[PDB]
Amino acid sequence: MIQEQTMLNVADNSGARRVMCIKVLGGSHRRYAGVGDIIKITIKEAIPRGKVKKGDVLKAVVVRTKKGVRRPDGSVIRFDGNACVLLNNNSEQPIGTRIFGPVTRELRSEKFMKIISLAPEV
Amino acid sequence: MIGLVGKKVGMTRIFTEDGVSIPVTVIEVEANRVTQVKDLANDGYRAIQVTTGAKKANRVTKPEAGHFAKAGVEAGRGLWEFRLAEGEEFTVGQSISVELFADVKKVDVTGTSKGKGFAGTVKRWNFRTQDATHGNSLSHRVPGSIGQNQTPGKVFKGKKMAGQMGNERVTVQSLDVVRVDAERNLLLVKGAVPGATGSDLIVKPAVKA
Amino acid sequence: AVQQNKPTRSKRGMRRSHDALTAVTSLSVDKTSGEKHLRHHITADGYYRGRKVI
Amino acid sequence: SNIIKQLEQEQMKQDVPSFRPGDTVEVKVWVVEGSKKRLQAFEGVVIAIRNRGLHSAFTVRKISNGEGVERVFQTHSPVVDSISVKRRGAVRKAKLYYLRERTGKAARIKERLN
Amino acid sequence: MRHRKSGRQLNRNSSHRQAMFRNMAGSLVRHEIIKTTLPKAKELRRVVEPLITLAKTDSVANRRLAFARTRDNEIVAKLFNELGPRFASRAGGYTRILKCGFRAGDNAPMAYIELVDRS
RNA sequence: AGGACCGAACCGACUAAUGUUGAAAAAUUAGCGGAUGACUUGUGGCUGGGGGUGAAAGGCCAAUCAAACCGGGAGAUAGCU
RNA sequence: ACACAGGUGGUCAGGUAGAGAAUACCAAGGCGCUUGAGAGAACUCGGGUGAAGGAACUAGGCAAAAUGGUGCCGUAACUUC
RNA sequence: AAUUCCUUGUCGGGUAAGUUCCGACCUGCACGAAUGGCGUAAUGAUGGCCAGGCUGUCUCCACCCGAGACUCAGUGAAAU
RNA sequence: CGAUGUCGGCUCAUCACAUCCUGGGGCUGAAGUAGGUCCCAAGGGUAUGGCUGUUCGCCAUUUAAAGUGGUACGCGAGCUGGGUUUAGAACGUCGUGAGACAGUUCGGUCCCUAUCUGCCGUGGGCGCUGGAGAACUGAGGGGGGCUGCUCCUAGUACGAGAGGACCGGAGUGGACGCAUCACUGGUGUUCGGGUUGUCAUGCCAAUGGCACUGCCCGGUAGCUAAAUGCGGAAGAGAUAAGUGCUGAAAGCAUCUAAGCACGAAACUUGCCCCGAGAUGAGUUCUCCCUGACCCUUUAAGGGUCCUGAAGGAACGUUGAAGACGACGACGUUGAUAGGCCGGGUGUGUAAGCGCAGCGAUGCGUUGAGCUAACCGGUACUAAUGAACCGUGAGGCUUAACCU
């Protein structure tokens, strides 16, 4: 439920702290980003000596959102904040080496086997 | 294959054992006693006519009761017609129950949509609202321009402006079935059907292959 | 918002075709007093369907 | 509409435990991956209960890794397996949405002991 | 769009609607007769009739609740002492509608209101 | 003490909406600035038309101002309609 | 020009909360505004709320939203101190 | 630069992206010393830019409360 | 020139094809993948931001694609007024000066109640040849026609390798539309609760009013999307460019001159909706009327009494139908609306009483009290008995049968 001009938390140790979603790739006139889909982000605040700095353009995926994700039985899993996980722009692999905070279950796919294994819970 | 006539009980949910919460519409389909069978000799086409429900014996008119007395069929709440395909045949006065749909997969549902009266261009054709501020005066949800200048100098037919919502027939296609139960005279479909609770509906097998 | 040519007495007449009212054409009678009153309304002196109510 | 009420009564699960808002409720939920299914715990405080026949649901707030995770639970779904109250809290409301802004010692639910 | 919506607004404020139905319902027990307009009479039925069946049982809690509405003590004692035992058998239908034509000032369709016990 | 500060009466008019054959020939509504001073206001007087007055816009001078209003020359003149 | 949402100088000024002639509810006192009754369409005007994002709208944060009181702690560049 | 036509001069900052802004260079079409020059604390219903909070401004509207519009009765215009 | 309002933006579009994508094909200096070019094709779709008033343009990032144009460089009796280009003021420059310079710079009132055509809906009257209630046929008209990515074929064909298919099949998305409230939610000033100030009910208590619903917290039904299902399909016919078979004219050859077969989101259908005013007014089924008498300048003539059918209209209760009409349900051979009973929901353990505590308060009754539009019922009230419109067998001519 993430769109353009959206501030986003970060769940890895790539170096970002607050990032800005500037695109929702994957479709013409696409409005929103769900969970586990490609978005292009820019970094607004970072730790001094992380793997990335301020003002870089690179892709990310959404792992938490306040809108939630609908289960097939009708349940919904929502969080207090919207958080993302950094990826390299060309290889689509995660920049960081750890995941902070739980992620959901619908990221389970061949592209994201690294993240859920690195996830601490769920 | 010919279709049936049902009444919308409402909506509920069905919990499959795997865990899918399928939203389901309950359609009460009382057995359709056939009131008229038509052929090519006098009508030039093949169709049958059914009735269902129960009407008051005082309120059914003399020509309406005369049609029911001829068929040997007790009075219902309405009359509907279905064309038959090649190979089908039916007799006047025979009943048709829910169990015709015991082997079909996809059905089409036809009904009259919920009437909403006079509704604006924002609702009738999803017209995007103009600026609510920045100097705008008396024109927020208006349709704006409706045509071009002196050439053509007129508004074309079929141009989208405001009008009447609802209260017209609308068919929803290719709905899956869930249950068939003539013991409860019921029928279960995944999804949503037009009309309100207690409205009239037509349920036919899907022509969409 | 302003008319361009003067309409006739005819065109005003066609517009006034639907303007006529209709009479009651049937006013009911109370069973006791026998006077004529509007249907489902009380009569002049306080009767309705044959009982005094006022 | 007695046809509807009889229809949902069949898939109505027979036994559910009684709980009210404020209760620290432990939920066991089936999860299926691959070819196996497992039972997954979920602890937390219930904050909103919607009682409506077959569509009844209740929402549990869980703190996790420093941040808050919220579920809703379709009570009569086959996905949820076991519900067990682990603490009887005392609240003055049927809805506890003010716990979205209270954390730590502020998010402290007094037990009910009734 | 009034789909399954009940309760008239009567071209007035919501508090004014409550205040009118608070005052004029007190007039129905006071004089047992009102000539008033037809739509106001139909929903006097919706407010007065729950009050009398509330007054069918007498208790200190019910008197205070019957004082929160109609805000008059003389109405409350009249409601409980007389129409309490008087209407202990009625299963609804505590009043009736008697149409009486129209006004002369504005042509407004009026109708009498009438508690059916009055003889 | 202060051509001080915040803010009512009071003086004014910066923004927006409505109005714009209006409730009103400039207003209402929500905000807004000054508010012991070069302040504001009641009563009376003084300054008059190529003249007055003007913390100066060519503004104001009886809903009229790059020369007021009323009457007169005057039936000005009009190669124009 | 109207039985007009405007303009018009002075005097009196109570209770509670409030610093107050602010403001809210009231006392004495005066009014309910010279068309009403329904229906509960679009659309317009005046407001209330809102998922998620939070200026991406637009010429422009226009409008709207937000801050608001008292006491105490503490408060930078610059400076005519 | 209230002045610069070529011009969105060139470089740096801010931005993911800046014809606006800020700092600098001087090739000043056509600055310049009381028709004042350069700074200048404070002040401004002043002009331009950026940031935090804030939100229906917007993605994209949705519902509700009131006044009209709509129906009935009474009176009853206008431009053209 | 007794007025045709300008650029730009917003809303709304409509058409052309010299086609941006998707579709089909020829040639290639076309290995494949990806392209170049050209032909056929208008069905459908055809970006978001930063800067500037901008159109345009550059930049960042998407997309299959971000097409070119006409429509008063579409669209101000639809919106804005940022620019140009009023009156104020200033800079540079020209002029002695008043002033001026599509040079710059700051500020700067955009009216209209729609008569006709047009369009969107919604009705009244009449007609369709006795009247009426239904159900349809279908002439005709409208809507819909978008598409990526992943997987299997296959890591095959092709290729030294890098790389990497067509054909076909499977799944899942982006946008658009329809429908719905089962789910998550929003609203929910008619439900419950908290609380401030004040006034009032004599007073404590408990309540009520006002302060934007006083300020808030939740929340029934309805509506609603952000929520949930569905769709755009398969197939058929004739085809465009193109691909051919047989075969002369013209002993060969040739898709063409005779004949025959393929060939695309276009066309005609298939899908959905409207549709007998289709004055060409249709088809089928059912229902109702079978009495007399006069008058005339005797006609498809006029009139009197009696009859008043089927059906319709009106009134009332009304509706998830609705601006009003219209549409649907019901009228005591009744659940149409309201009330009531039970339930459900929502809010949260009322008031009163008792105990503890100097007290604010807490506890027991007590998950109590109250509950709107919801569910199941329930004649308690209002839907009255009657009147009103509607007629007396339905023209002429011809043909076939029954006689």
PDB file of C-alpha atoms (C1' of nucleotides) in Angstrom, chain I residues 42-155:
ATOM      1  C1'   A I  42      -7.839   2.559 -36.246  1.00  0.00           C
ATOM      2  C1'   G I  43     -10.171  -2.710 -32.679  1.00  0.00           C
ATOM      3  C1'   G I  44      -8.117  -1.644 -27.832  1.00  0.00           C
ATOM      4  C1'   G I  45      -4.348   0.676 -24.955  1.00  0.00           C
ATOM      5  C1'   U I  46      -1.012   4.635 -25.323  1.00  0.00           C
ATOM      6  C1'   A I  47       3.468   7.486 -17.865  1.00  0.00           C
ATOM      7  C1'   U I  48       4.810   9.765 -12.846  1.00  0.00           C
ATOM      8  C1'   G I  49       7.810  13.612 -10.923  1.00  0.00           C
ATOM      9  C1'   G I  50      12.092  18.189 -10.602  1.00  0.00           C
ATOM     10  C1'   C I  51      12.656  23.158 -13.205  1.00  0.00           C
ATOM     11  C1'   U I  52       9.979  26.988 -15.680  1.00  0.00           C
ATOM     12  C1'   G I  53       3.197  30.579 -16.491  1.00  0.00           C
ATOM     13  C1'   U I  54       4.630  27.616 -20.264  1.00  0.00           C
ATOM     14  C1'   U I  55       3.346  24.567 -25.286  1.00  0.00           C
ATOM     15  C1'   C I  56       8.005  22.647 -26.060  1.00  0.00           C
ATOM     16  C1'   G I  57      12.413  21.233 -23.872  1.00  0.00           C
ATOM     17  C1'   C I  58      16.240  18.920 -20.492  1.00  0.00           C
ATOM     18  C1'   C I  59      16.736  15.684 -16.349  1.00  0.00           C
ATOM     19  C1'   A I  60      15.435  11.315 -12.841  1.00  0.00           C
ATOM     20  C1'   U I  61      12.687   6.853 -12.937  1.00  0.00           C
ATOM     21  C1'   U I  62       8.942   3.525 -15.144  1.00  0.00           C
ATOM     22  C1'   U I  63       6.146   1.042 -19.337  1.00  0.00           C
ATOM     23  C1'   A I  64       4.567  -3.402 -24.399  1.00  0.00           C
ATOM     24  C1'   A I  65       3.951   1.731 -25.746  1.00  0.00           C
ATOM     25  C1'   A I  66       4.691   6.692 -23.339  1.00  0.00           C
ATOM     26  C1'   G I  67       2.192   8.046 -31.601  1.00  0.00           C
ATOM     27  C1'   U I  68       1.522  12.163 -35.224  1.00  0.00           C
ATOM     28  C1'   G I  69      -2.403  15.471 -36.260  1.00  0.00           C
ATOM     29  C1'   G I  70      -7.761  17.829 -37.055  1.00  0.00           C
ATOM     30  C1'   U I  71     -11.760  19.346 -34.024  1.00  0.00           C
ATOM     31  C1'   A I  72     -12.515  28.503 -33.323  1.00  0.00           C
ATOM     32  C1'   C I  73      -3.681  26.082 -32.751  1.00  0.00           C
ATOM     33  C1'   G I  74     -11.399  21.331 -29.466  1.00  0.00           C
ATOM     34  C1'   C I  75     -13.287  22.729 -24.785  1.00  0.00           C
ATOM     35  C1'   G I  76     -13.665  30.195 -19.780  1.00  0.00           C
ATOM     36  C1'   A I  77     -23.211  30.938 -20.864  1.00  0.00           C
ATOM     37  C1'   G I  78     -17.488  24.148 -17.769  1.00  0.00           C
ATOM     38  C1'   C I  79     -13.263  25.670 -14.066  1.00  0.00           C
ATOM     39  C1'   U I  80      -8.295  28.592 -13.061  1.00  0.00           C
ATOM     40  C1'   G I  81      -6.015  33.446 -14.248  1.00  0.00           C
ATOM     41  C1'   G I  82       0.297  31.805 -13.636  1.00  0.00           C
ATOM     42  C1'   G I  83       1.922  34.572 -18.660  1.00  0.00           C
ATOM     43  C1'   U I  84       0.911  38.216 -22.362  1.00  0.00           C
ATOM     44  C1'   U I  85      -1.296  43.103 -21.998  1.00  0.00           C
ATOM     45  C1'   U I  86      -5.053  48.361 -17.966  1.00  0.00           C
ATOM     46  C1'   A I  87      -4.642  51.882 -14.070  1.00  0.00           C
ATOM     47  C1'   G I  88       0.465  51.832  -8.755  1.00  0.00           C
ATOM     48  C1'   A I  89       5.943  51.416  -8.042  1.00  0.00           C
ATOM     49  C1'   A I  90      11.101  50.340  -9.256  1.00  0.00           C
ATOM     50  C1'   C I  91      15.951  48.756 -12.118  1.00  0.00           C
ATOM     51  C1'   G I  92      18.792  49.068 -16.913  1.00  0.00           C
ATOM     52  C1'   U I  93      18.312  51.712 -21.428  1.00  0.00           C
ATOM     53  C1'   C I  94      16.197  56.016 -24.951  1.00  0.00           C
ATOM     54  C1'   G I  95      14.483  60.960 -24.604  1.00  0.00           C
ATOM     55  C1'   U I  96      15.886  67.983 -22.222  1.00  0.00           C
ATOM     56  C1'   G I  97      10.912  66.387 -20.824  1.00  0.00           C
ATOM     57  C1'   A I  98       5.870  64.396 -20.449  1.00  0.00           C
ATOM     58  C1'   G I  99       6.721  59.422 -21.214  1.00  0.00           C
ATOM     59  C1'   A I 100       8.504  54.786 -23.634  1.00  0.00           C
ATOM     60  C1'   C I 101      11.106  50.019 -24.431  1.00  0.00           C
ATOM     61  C1'   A I 102       6.458  40.907 -26.159  1.00  0.00           C
ATOM     62  C1'   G I 103      13.366  43.984 -21.513  1.00  0.00           C
ATOM     63  C1'   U I 104      13.061  42.891 -16.269  1.00  0.00           C
ATOM     64  C1'   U I 105      10.585  43.168 -11.419  1.00  0.00           C
ATOM     65  C1'   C I 106       6.376  43.202  -6.977  1.00  0.00           C
ATOM     66  C1'   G I 107       0.814  43.738  -6.541  1.00  0.00           C
ATOM     67  C1'   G I 108      -3.558  43.630  -9.331  1.00  0.00           C
ATOM     68  C1'   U I 109     -12.955  42.469  -9.348  1.00  0.00           C
ATOM     69  C1'   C I 110     -13.350  36.272 -14.991  1.00  0.00           C
ATOM     70  C1'   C I 111     -21.387  37.824 -14.635  1.00  0.00           C
ATOM     71  C1'   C I 112     -25.679  34.762 -16.539  1.00  0.00           C
ATOM     72  C1'   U I 113     -32.132  31.590 -12.925  1.00  0.00           C
ATOM     73  C1'   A I 114     -31.213  27.642 -20.305  1.00  0.00           C
ATOM     74  C1'   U I 115     -36.232  29.682 -24.570  1.00  0.00           C
ATOM     75  C1'   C I 116     -34.809  26.653 -29.199  1.00  0.00           C
ATOM     76  C1'   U I 117     -31.261  22.743 -31.368  1.00  0.00           C
ATOM     77  C1'   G I 118     -28.192  18.921 -29.010  1.00  0.00           C
ATOM     78  C1'   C I 119     -27.342  15.080 -25.204  1.00  0.00           C
ATOM     79  C1'   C I 120     -28.411  12.262 -20.596  1.00  0.00           C
ATOM     80  C1'   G I 121     -32.370  10.085 -18.042  1.00  0.00           C
ATOM     81  C1'   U I 122     -37.546   9.894 -16.586  1.00  0.00           C
ATOM     82  C1'   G I 123     -43.049  10.448 -17.641  1.00  0.00           C
ATOM     83  C1'   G I 124     -48.194  11.928 -19.720  1.00  0.00           C
ATOM     84  C1'   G I 125     -51.462  11.454 -24.324  1.00  0.00           C
ATOM     85  C1'   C I 126     -52.700   8.836 -28.643  1.00  0.00           C
ATOM     86  C1'   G I 127     -51.995   4.993 -32.149  1.00  0.00           C
ATOM     87  C1'   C I 128     -51.264  -0.255 -33.451  1.00  0.00           C
ATOM     88  C1'   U I 129     -59.133  -1.601 -35.751  1.00  0.00           C
ATOM     89  C1'   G I 130     -63.724  -5.251 -29.815  1.00  0.00           C
ATOM     90  C1'   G I 131     -61.355  -4.467 -24.705  1.00  0.00           C
ATOM     91  C1'   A I 132     -57.701  -6.385 -21.131  1.00  0.00           C
ATOM     92  C1'   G I 133     -53.441  -9.252 -18.394  1.00  0.00           C
ATOM     93  C1'   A I 134     -49.002 -11.564 -19.475  1.00  0.00           C
ATOM     94  C1'   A I 135     -44.656 -14.064 -21.929  1.00  0.00           C
ATOM     95  C1'   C I 136     -41.630 -13.694 -26.095  1.00  0.00           C
ATOM     96  C1'   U I 137     -39.652 -13.432 -31.480  1.00  0.00           C
ATOM     97  C1'   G I 138     -36.480 -10.195 -33.518  1.00  0.00           C
ATOM     98  C1'   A I 139     -35.503  -5.594 -37.529  1.00  0.00           C
ATOM     99  C1'   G I 140     -32.437  -2.133 -35.297  1.00  0.00           C
ATOM    100  C1'   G I 141     -28.950   0.239 -31.563  1.00  0.00           C
ATOM    101  C1'   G I 142     -25.316   0.480 -27.708  1.00  0.00           C
ATOM    102  C1'   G I 143     -21.382  -1.689 -24.373  1.00  0.00           C
ATOM    103  C1'   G I 144     -17.015  -4.855 -24.470  1.00  0.00           C
ATOM    104  C1'   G I 145     -12.526  -5.754 -27.573  1.00  0.00           C
ATOM    105  C1'   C I 146      -5.600  -3.688 -23.585  1.00  0.00           C
ATOM    106  C1'   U I 147      -1.421  -6.493 -22.013  1.00  0.00           C
ATOM    107  C1'   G I 148       3.269  -7.837 -19.242  1.00  0.00           C
ATOM    108  C1'   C I 149       6.046 -11.429 -16.403  1.00  0.00           C
ATOM    109  C1'   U I 150       7.107 -16.547 -14.801  1.00  0.00           C
ATOM    110  C1'   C I 151       7.098 -21.890 -15.810  1.00  0.00           C
ATOM    111  C1'   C I 152       6.848 -26.586 -19.310  1.00  0.00           C
ATOM    112  C1'   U I 153       8.213 -27.824 -24.202  1.00  0.00           C
ATOM    113  C1'   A I 154      14.082 -26.843 -23.542  1.00  0.00           C
ATOM    114  C1'   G I 155      18.093 -25.081 -21.899  1.00  0.00           C
TER     115        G I 155
END
